[PDB]
Amino acid sequence: AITCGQVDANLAPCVPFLTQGGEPGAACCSGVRTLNGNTQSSDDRRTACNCVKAAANRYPNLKDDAAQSLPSKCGISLTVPISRTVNCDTIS
């Protein structure tokens, strides 16, 4: 049960750029803002999955092209092991 506003603050100055077509990054990108907002602890890195999924509220299925290439240009610095099927942002 961890959440953050870093994700929307990272992409905030770039919202119209990122949702428009092409490869927006030379103007601004989320990784520039993550350079300032670094993580504290190993378990706090789990915030990254709980935050990268929050940005999908601004990027619905309307923009599948931008949404596929979104993490290819500008994402959140996650640190989790590789598995077959992983459950993220889930609540019981």
TrEMBL record:
Disulfide bonds join 4-51, 14-28, 29-74, 49-88. One of its GO terms (biological process) is lipid transport. Belongs to the plant LTP family. It comes from the Eukaryota. One of its GO terms (molecular function) is lipid binding. This is Non-specific lipid-transfer protein. Plant non-specific lipid-transfer proteins transfer phospholipids as well as galactolipids across membranes. May play a role in wax or cutin deposition in the cell walls of expanding epidermal cells and certain secretory tissues. Residues 4-88 form the Bifunctional inhibitor/plant lipid transfer protein/seed storage helical domain. Keywords: Lipid-binding, Signal, Transport.
